[PDB]
PDB file of N, CA and C in Angstrom:
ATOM      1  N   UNK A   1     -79.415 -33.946  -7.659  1.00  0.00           N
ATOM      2  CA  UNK A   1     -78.118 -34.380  -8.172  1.00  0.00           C
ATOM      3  C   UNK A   1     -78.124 -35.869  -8.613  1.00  0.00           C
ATOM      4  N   UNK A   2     -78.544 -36.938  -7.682  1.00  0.00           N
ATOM      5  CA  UNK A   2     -78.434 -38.233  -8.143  1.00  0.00           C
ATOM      6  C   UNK A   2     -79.807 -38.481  -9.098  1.00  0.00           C
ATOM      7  N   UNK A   3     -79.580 -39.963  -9.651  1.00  0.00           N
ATOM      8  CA  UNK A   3     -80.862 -40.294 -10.435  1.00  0.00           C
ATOM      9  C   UNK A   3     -81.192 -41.695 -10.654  1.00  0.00           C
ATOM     10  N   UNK A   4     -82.087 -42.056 -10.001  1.00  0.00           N
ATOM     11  CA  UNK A   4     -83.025 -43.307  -9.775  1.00  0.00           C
ATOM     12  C   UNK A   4     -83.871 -43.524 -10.708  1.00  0.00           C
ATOM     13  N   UNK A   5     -84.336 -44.918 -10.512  1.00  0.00           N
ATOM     14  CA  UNK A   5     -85.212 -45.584 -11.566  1.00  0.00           C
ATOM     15  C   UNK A   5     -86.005 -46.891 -11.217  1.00  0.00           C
ATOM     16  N   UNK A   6     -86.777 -46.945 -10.625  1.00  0.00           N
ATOM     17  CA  UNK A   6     -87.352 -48.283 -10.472  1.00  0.00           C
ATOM     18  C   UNK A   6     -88.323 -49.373 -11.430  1.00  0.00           C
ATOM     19  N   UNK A   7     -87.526 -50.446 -11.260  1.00  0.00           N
ATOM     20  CA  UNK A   7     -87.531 -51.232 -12.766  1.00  0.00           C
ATOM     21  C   UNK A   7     -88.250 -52.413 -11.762  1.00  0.00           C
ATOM     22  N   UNK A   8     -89.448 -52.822 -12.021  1.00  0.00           N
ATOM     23  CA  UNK A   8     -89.851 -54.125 -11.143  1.00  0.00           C
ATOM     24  C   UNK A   8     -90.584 -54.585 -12.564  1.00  0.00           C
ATOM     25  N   UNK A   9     -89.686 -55.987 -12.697  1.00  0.00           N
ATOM     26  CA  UNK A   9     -89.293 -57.380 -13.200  1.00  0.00           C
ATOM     27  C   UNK A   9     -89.718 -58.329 -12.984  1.00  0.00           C
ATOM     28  N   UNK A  10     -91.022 -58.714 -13.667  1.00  0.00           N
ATOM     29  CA  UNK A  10     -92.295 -59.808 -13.396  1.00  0.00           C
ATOM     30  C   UNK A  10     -91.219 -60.976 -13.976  1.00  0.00           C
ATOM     31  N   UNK A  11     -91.894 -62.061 -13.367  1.00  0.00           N
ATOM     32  CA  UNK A  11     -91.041 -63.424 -13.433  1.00  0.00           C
ATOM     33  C   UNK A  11     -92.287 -64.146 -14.471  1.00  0.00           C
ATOM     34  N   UNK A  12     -91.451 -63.981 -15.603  1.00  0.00           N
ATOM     35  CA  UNK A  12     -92.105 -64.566 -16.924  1.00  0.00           C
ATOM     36  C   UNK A  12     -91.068 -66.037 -17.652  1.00  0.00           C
ATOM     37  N   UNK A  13     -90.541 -66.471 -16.628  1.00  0.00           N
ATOM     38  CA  UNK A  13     -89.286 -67.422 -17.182  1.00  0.00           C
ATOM     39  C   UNK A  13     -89.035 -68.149 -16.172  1.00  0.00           C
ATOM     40  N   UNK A  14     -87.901 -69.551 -16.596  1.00  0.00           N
ATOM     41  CA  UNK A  14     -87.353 -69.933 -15.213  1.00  0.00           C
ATOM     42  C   UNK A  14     -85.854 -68.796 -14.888  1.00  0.00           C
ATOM     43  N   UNK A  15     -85.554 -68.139 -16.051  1.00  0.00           N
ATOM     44  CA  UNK A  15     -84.263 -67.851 -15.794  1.00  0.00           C
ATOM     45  C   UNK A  15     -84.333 -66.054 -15.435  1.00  0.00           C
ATOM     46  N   UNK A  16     -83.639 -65.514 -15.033  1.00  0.00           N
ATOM     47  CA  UNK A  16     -83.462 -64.426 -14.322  1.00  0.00           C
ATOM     48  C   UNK A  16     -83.104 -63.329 -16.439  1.00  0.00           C
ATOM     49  N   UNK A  17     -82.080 -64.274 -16.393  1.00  0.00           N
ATOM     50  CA  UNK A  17     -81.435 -63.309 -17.825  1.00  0.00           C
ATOM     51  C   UNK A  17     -80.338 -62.194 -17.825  1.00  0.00           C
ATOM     52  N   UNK A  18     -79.955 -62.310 -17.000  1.00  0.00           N
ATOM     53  CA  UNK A  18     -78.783 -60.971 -16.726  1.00  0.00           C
ATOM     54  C   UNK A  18     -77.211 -61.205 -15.856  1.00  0.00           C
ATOM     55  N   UNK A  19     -76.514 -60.210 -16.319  1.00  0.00           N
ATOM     56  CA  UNK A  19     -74.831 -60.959 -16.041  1.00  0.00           C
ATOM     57  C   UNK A  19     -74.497 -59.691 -15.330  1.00  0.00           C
ATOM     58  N   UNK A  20     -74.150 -59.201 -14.111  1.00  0.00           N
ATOM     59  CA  UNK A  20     -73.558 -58.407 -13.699  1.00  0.00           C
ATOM     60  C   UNK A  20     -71.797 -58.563 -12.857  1.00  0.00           C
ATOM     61  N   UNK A  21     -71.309 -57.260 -12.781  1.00  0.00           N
ATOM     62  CA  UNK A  21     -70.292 -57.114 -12.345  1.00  0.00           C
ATOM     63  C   UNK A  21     -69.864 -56.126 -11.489  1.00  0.00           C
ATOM     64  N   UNK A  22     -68.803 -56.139 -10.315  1.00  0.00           N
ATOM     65  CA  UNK A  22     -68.996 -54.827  -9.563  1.00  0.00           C
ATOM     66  C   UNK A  22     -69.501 -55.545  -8.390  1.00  0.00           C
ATOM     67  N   UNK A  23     -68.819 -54.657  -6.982  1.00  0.00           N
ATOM     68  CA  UNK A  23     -69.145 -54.725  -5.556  1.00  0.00           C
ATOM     69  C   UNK A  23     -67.635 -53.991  -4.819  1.00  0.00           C
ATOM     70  N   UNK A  24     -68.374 -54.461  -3.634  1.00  0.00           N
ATOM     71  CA  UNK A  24     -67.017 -53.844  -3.230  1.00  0.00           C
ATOM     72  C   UNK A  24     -65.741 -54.330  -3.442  1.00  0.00           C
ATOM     73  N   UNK A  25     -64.243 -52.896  -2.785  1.00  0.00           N
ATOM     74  CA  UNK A  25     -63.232 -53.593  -3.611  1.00  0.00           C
ATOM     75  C   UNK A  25     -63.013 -53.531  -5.151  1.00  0.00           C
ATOM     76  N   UNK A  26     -64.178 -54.291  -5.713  1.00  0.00           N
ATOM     77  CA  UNK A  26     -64.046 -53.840  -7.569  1.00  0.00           C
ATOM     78  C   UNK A  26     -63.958 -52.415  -7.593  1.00  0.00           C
ATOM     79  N   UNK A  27     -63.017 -52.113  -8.980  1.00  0.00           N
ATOM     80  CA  UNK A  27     -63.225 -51.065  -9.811  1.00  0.00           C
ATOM     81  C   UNK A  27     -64.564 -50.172  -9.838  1.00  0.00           C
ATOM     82  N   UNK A  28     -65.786 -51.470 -10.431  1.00  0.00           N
ATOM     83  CA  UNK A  28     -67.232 -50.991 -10.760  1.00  0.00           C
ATOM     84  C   UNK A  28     -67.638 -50.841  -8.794  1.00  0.00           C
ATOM     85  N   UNK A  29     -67.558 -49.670  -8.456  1.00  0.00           N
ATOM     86  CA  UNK A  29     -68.058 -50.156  -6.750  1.00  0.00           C
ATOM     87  C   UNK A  29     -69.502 -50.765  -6.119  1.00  0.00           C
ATOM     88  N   UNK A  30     -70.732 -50.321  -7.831  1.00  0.00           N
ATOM     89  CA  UNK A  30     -71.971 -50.916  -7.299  1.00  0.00           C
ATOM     90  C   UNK A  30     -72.155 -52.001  -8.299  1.00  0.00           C
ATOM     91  N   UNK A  31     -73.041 -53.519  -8.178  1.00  0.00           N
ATOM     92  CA  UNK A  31     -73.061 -54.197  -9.695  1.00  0.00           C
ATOM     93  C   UNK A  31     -73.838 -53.357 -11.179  1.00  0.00           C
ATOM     94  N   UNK A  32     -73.274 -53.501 -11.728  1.00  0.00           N
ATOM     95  CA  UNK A  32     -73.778 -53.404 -12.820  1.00  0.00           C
ATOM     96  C   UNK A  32     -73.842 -54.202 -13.950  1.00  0.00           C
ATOM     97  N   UNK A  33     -74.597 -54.001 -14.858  1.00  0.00           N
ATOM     98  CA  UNK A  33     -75.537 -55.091 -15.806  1.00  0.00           C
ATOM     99  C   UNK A  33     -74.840 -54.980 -16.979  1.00  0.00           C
ATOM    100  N   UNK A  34     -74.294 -55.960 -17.248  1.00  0.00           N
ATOM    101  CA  UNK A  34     -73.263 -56.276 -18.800  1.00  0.00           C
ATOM    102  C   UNK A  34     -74.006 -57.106 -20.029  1.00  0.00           C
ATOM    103  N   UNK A  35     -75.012 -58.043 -19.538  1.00  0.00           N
ATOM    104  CA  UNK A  35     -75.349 -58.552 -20.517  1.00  0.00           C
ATOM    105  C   UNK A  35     -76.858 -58.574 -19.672  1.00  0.00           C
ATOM    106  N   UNK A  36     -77.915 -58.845 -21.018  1.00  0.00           N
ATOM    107  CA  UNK A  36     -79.083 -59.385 -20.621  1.00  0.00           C
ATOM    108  C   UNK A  36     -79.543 -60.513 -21.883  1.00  0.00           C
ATOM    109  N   UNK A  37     -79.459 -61.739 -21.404  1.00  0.00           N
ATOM    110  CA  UNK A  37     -79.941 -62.423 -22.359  1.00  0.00           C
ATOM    111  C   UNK A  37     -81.376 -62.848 -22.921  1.00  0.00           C
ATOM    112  N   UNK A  38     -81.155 -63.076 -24.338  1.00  0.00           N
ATOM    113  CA  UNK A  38     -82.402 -62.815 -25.082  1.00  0.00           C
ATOM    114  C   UNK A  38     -83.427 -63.998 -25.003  1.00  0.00           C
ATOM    115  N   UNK A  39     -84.909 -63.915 -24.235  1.00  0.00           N
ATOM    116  CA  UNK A  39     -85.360 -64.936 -23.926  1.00  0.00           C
ATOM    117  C   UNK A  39     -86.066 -65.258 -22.375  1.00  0.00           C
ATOM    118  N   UNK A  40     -84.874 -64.410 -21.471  1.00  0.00           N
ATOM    119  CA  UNK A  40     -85.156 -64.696 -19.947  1.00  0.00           C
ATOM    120  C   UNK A  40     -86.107 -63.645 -19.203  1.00  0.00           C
ATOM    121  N   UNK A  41     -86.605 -63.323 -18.289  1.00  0.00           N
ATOM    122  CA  UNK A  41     -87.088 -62.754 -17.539  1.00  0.00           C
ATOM    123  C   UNK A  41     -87.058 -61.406 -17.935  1.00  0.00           C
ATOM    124  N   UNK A  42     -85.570 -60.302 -17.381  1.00  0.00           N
ATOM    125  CA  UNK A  42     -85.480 -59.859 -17.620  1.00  0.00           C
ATOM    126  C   UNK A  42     -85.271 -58.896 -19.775  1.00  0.00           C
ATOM    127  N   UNK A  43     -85.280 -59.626 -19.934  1.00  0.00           N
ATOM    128  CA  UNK A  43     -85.460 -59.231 -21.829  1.00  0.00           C
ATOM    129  C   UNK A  43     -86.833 -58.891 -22.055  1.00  0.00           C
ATOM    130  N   UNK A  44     -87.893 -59.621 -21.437  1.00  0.00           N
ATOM    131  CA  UNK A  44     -89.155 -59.313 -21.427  1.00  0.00           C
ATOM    132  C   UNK A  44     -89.965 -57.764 -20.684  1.00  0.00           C
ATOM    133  N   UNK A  45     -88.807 -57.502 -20.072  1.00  0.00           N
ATOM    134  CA  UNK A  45     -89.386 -55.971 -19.336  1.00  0.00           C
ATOM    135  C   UNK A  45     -88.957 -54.691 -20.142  1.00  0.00           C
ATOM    136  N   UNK A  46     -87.512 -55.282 -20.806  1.00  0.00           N
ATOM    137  CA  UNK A  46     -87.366 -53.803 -21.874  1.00  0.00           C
ATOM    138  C   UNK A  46     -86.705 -52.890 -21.327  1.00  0.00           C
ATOM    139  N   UNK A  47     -87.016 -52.101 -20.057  1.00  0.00           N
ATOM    140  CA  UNK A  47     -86.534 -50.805 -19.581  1.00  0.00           C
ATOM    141  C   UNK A  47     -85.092 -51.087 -18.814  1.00  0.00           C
ATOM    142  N   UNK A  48     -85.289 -52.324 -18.340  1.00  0.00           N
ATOM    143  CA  UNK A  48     -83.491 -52.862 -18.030  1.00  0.00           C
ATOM    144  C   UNK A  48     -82.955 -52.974 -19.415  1.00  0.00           C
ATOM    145  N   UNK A  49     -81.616 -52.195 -19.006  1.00  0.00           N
ATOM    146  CA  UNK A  49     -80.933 -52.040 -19.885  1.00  0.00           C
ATOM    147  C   UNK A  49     -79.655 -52.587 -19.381  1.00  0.00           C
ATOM    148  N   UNK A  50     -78.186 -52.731 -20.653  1.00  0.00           N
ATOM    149  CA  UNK A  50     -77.090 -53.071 -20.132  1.00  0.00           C
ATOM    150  C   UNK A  50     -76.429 -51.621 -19.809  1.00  0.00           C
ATOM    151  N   UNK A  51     -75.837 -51.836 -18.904  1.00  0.00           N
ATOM    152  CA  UNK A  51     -74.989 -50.275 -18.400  1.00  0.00           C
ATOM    153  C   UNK A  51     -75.471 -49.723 -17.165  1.00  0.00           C
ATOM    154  N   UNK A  52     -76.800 -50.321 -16.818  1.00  0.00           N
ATOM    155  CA  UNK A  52     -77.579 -50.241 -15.642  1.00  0.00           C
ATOM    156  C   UNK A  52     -76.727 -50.266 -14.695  1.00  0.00           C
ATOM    157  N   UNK A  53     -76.937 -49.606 -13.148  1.00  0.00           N
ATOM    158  CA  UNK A  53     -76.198 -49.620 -12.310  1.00  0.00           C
ATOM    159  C   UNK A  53     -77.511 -50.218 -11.093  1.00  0.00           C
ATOM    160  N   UNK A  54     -77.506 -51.238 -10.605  1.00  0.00           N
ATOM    161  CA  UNK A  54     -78.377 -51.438  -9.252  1.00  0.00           C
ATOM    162  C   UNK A  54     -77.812 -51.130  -8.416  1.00  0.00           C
ATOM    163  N   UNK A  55     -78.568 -49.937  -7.589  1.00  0.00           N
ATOM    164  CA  UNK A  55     -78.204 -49.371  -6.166  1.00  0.00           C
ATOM    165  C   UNK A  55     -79.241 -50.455  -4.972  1.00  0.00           C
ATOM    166  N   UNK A  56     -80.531 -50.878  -5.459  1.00  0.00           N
ATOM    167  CA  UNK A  56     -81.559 -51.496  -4.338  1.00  0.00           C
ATOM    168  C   UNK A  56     -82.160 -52.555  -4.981  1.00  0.00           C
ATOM    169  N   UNK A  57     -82.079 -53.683  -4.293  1.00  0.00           N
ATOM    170  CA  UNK A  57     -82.737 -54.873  -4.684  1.00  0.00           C
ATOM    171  C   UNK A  57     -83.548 -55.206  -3.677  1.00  0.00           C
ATOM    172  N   UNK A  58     -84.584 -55.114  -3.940  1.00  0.00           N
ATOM    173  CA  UNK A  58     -86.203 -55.237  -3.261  1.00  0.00           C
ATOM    174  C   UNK A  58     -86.014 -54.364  -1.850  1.00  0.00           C
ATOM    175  N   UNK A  59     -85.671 -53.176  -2.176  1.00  0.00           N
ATOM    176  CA  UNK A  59     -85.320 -52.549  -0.886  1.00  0.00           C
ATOM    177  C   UNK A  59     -84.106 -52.426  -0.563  1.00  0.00           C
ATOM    178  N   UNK A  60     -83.577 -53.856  -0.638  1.00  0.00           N
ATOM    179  CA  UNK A  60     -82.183 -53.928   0.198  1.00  0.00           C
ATOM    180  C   UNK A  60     -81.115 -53.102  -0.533  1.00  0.00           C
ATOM    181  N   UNK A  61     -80.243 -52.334   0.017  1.00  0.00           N
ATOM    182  CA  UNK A  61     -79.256 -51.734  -0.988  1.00  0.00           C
ATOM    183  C   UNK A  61     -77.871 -52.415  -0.821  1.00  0.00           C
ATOM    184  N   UNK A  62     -76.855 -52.471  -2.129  1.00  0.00           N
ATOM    185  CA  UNK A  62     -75.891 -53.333  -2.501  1.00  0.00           C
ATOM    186  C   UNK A  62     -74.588 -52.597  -1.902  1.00  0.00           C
ATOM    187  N   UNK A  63     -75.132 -51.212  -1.799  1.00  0.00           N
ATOM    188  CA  UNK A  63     -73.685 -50.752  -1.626  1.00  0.00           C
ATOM    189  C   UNK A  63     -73.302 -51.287  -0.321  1.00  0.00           C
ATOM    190  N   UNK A  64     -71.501 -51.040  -0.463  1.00  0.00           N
ATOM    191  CA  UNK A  64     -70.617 -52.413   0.927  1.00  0.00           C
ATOM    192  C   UNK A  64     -71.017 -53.681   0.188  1.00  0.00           C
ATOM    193  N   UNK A  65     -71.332 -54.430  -0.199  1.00  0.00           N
ATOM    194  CA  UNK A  65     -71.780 -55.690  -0.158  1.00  0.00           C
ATOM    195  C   UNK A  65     -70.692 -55.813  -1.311  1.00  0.00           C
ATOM    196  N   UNK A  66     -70.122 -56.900  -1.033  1.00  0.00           N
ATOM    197  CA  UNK A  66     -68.594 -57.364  -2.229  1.00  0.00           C
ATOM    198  C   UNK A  66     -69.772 -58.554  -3.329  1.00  0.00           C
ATOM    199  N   UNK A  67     -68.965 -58.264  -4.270  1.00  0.00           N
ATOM    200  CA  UNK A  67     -69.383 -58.903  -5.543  1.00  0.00           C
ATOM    201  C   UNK A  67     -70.675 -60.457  -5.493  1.00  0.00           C
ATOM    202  N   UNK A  68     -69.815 -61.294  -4.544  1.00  0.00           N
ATOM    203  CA  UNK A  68     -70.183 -62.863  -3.942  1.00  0.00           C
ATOM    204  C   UNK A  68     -71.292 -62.510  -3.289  1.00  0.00           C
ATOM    205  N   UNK A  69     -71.743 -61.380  -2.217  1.00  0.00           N
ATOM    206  CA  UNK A  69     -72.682 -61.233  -1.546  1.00  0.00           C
ATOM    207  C   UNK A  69     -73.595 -60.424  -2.234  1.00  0.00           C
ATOM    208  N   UNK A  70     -73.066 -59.796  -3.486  1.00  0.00           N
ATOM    209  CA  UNK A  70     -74.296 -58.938  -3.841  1.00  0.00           C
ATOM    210  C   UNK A  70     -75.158 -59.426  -4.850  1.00  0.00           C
ATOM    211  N   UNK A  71     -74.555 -61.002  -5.777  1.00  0.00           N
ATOM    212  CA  UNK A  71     -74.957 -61.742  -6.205  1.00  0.00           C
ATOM    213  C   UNK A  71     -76.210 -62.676  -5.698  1.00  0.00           C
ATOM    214  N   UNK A  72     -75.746 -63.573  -4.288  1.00  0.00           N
ATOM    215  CA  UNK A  72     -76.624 -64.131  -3.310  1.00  0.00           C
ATOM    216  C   UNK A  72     -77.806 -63.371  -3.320  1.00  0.00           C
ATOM    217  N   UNK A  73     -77.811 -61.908  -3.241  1.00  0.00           N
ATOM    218  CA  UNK A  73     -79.386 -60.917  -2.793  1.00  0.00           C
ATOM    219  C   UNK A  73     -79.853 -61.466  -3.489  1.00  0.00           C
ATOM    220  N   UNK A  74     -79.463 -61.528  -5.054  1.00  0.00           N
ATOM    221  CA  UNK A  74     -80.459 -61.565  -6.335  1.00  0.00           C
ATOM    222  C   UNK A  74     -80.639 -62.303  -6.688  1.00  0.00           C
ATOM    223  N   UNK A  75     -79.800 -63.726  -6.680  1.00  0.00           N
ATOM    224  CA  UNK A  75     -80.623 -65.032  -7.015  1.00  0.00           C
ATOM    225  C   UNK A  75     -81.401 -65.817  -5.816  1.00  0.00           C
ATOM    226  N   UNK A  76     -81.366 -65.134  -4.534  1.00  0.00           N
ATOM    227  CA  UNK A  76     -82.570 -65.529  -3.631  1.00  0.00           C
ATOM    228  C   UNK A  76     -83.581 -64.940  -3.814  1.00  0.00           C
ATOM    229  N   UNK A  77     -83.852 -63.577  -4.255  1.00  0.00           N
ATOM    230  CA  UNK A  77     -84.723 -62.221  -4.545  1.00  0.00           C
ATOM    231  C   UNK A  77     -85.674 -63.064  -5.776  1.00  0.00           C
ATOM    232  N   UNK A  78     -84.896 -63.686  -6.365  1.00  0.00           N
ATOM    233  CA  UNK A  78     -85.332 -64.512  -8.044  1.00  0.00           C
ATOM    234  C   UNK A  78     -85.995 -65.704  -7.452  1.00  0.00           C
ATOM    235  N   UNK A  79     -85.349 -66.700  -6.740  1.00  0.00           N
ATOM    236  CA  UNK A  79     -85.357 -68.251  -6.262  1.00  0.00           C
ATOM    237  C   UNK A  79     -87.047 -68.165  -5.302  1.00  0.00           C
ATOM    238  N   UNK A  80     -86.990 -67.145  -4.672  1.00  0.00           N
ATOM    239  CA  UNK A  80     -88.243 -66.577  -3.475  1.00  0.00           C
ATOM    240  C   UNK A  80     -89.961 -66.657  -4.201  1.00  0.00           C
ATOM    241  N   UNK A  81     -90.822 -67.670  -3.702  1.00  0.00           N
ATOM    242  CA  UNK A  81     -92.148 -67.779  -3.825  1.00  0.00           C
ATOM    243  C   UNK A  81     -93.084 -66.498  -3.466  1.00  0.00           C
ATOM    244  N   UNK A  82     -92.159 -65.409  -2.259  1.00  0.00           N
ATOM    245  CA  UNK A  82     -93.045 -64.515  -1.777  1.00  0.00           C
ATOM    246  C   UNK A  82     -93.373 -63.710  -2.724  1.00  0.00           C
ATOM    247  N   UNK A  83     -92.790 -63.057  -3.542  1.00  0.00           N
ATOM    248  CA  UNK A  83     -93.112 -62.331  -4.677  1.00  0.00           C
ATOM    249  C   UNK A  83     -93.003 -63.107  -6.254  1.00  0.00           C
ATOM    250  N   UNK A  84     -93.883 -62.449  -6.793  1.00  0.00           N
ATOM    251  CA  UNK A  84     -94.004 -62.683  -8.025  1.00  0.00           C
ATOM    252  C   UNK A  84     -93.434 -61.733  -9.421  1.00  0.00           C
ATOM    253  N   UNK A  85     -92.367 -60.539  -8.610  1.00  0.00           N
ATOM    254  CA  UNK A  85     -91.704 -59.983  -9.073  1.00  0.00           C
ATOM    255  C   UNK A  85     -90.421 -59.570  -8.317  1.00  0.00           C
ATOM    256  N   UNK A  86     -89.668 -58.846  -8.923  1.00  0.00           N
ATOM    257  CA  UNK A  86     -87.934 -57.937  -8.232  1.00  0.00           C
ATOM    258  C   UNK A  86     -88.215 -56.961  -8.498  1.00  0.00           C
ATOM    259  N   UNK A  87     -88.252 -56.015  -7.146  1.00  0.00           N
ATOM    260  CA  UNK A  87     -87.836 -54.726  -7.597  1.00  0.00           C
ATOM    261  C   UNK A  87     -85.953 -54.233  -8.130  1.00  0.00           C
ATOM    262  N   UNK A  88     -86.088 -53.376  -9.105  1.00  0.00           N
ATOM    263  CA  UNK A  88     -84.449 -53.121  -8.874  1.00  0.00           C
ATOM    264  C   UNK A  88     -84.583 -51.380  -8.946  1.00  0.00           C
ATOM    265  N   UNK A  89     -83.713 -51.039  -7.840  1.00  0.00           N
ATOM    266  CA  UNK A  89     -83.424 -49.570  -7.904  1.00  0.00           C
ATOM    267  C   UNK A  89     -82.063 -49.203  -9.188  1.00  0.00           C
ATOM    268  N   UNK A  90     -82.308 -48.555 -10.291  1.00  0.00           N
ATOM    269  CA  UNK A  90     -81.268 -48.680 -11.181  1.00  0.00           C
ATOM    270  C   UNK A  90     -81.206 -47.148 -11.566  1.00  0.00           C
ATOM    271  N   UNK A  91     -79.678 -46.776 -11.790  1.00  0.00           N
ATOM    272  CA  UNK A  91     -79.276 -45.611 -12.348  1.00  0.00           C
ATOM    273  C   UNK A  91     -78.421 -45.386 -13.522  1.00  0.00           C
ATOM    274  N   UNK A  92     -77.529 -44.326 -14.372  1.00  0.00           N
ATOM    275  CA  UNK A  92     -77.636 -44.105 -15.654  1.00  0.00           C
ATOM    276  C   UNK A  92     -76.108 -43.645 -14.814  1.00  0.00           C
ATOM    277  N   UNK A  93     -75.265 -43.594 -14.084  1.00  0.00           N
ATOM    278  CA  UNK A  93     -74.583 -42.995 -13.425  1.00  0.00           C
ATOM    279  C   UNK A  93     -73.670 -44.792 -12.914  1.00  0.00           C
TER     280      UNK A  93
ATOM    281  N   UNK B   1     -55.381 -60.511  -7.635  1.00  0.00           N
ATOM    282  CA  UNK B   1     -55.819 -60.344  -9.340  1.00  0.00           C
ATOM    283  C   UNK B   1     -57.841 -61.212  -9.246  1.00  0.00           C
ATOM    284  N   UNK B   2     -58.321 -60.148  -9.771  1.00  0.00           N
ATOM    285  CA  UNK B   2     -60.071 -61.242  -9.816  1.00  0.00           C
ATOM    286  C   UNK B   2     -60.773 -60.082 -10.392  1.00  0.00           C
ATOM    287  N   UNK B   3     -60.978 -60.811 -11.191  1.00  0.00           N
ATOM    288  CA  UNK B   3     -62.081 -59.758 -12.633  1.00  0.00           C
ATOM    289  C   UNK B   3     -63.435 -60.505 -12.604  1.00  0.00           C
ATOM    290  N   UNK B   4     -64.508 -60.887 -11.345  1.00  0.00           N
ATOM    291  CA  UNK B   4     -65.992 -61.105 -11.121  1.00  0.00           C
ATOM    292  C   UNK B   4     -67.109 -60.958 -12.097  1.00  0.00           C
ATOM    293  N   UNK B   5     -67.466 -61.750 -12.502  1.00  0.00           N
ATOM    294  CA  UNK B   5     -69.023 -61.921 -13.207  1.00  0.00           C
ATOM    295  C   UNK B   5     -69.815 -62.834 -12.720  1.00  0.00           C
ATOM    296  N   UNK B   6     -70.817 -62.587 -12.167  1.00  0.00           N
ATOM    297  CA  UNK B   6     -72.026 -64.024 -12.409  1.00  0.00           C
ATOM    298  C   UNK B   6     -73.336 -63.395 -13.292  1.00  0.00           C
ATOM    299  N   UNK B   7     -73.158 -65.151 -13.402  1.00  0.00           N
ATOM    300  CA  UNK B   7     -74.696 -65.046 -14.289  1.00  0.00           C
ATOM    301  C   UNK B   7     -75.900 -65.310 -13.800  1.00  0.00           C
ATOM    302  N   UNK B   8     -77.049 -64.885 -14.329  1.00  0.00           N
ATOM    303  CA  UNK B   8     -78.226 -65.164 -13.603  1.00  0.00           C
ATOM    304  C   UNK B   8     -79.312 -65.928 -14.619  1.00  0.00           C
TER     305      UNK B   8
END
């Protein structure tokens, strides 16, 4: 029934490249991806798309997590020396 | 009222 996608996002930039919206409380209940700008990190992988829905960021999953906190995952997930990429769990749903 | 975006 559901449908997953794992999109891991080599860090080819200083900038991440992407605008999401959505958490808990919101309308959108998981974030999802509104813009990706042309140039950054993410633009370079292609298979992220806008309309994307992230359910898991490097494992961790967003759902419960309100807008402010589900933001924090991903620009520490980005900011972090341990990896040299992000995983994102993303769906079409 | 709060209509949320960040950028990355």
């Amino acid at each position: 029934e559901p449908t997953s996608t794992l999109v891991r996002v080599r860090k080819s930039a200083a900038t991440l490249g992407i605008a999401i919206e959505g958490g808990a409380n919101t309308r959108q209940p998981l974030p999802r991806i509104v813009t990706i700008q042309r140039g950054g990190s993410a633009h370079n992988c292609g298979q992220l798309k806008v309309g994307h829905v992230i359910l898991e960021v490097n494992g961790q999953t967003l759902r419960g997590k309100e807008h402010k906190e589900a933001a924090r995952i991903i620009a520490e997930a980005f900011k972090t020396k341990e990896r040299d990429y992000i995983d994102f769990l993303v769906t079409e749903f | 009222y709060d209509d949320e975006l960040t950028f990355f």
